[PDB]
Design a protein around this ligand. Structure first.
Ligand SMILES: COc1ccc(S(=O)(=O)N(CC(=O)NO)CC(C)C)cc1
Ligand SMILES: [Ca+2]
Ligand SMILES: [Ca+2]
Ligand SMILES: [Ca+2]
Ligand SMILES: [Zn+2]
Ligand SMILES: [Zn+2]
Length: 159
């Protein structure tokens, strides 16, 4: 298997906030996305508002300091680094997308669930029902659930 966090208590911090959405709505989407993974593993996530965190959540555009520049509107929506120090774990969202609560634009929550999967050590799935399948598709958020493949994947890494 690939890198995993060698601890079950994992911190995150939101570096900055997209202007596409209300700040409260970003906080909510991210909290909910971590909860999805916490709900099927022994992992515990703690939000920090200031200081050192394992997973940094970042909205940025174009070339943004890592060796993986974003590409404008469309195309690549987001990327994340697997567990490790520094940029390890970090989840980056392309600000040239239009981030949403809803079905229009790109849903932050669903994209974050995907991204968070990578920040925890998952790669892509070949199951089209899996949140880790590498195509963005809106599905009703109130009824969203991880597929059986996603749960096998993450439980193979933790627990
Ligand atoms: C559900 O969340 C996803 C997040 C990003 C992608 S992506 O289109 O930006 N993409 C990069 C991605 O894997 N980063 O995590 C797939 C790529 C194979 C085109 C698609 C779905
Ligand atoms: Ca990190
Ligand atoms: Ca893009
Ligand atoms: Ca935007
Ligand atoms: Zn990046
Ligand atoms: Zn991905």
């Amino acid at each position: 298997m690939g890198p995993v966090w060698r601890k079950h208590y994992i911190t995150y911090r939101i570096n900055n906030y997209t202007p596409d959405m209300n700040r409260e709505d970003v906080d909510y989407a991210i909290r909910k996305a971590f909860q999805v993974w916490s709900n099927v593993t022994p992992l515990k996530f703690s939000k920090i508002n200031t200081g050192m965190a394992d997973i940094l959540v970042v909205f940025a555009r174009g070339a943004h300091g890592d060796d993986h520049a974003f590409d404008g509107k469309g195309g690549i929506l987001a990327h994340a680094f697997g567990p490790g120090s520094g940029i390890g774990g970090d989840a980056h969202f392309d600000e040239d997308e239009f981030w949403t609560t809803h079905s229009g634009g790109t849903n932050l929550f669903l994209t974050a669930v995907h991204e968070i999967g990578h920040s925890l050590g998952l790669g892509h799935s070949s199951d089209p029902k899996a949140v880790m399948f590498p195509t963005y598709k809106y599905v009703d958020i109130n009824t969203f659930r991880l597929s059986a493949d996603d749960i096998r994947g993450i439980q193979s890494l933790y627990g």
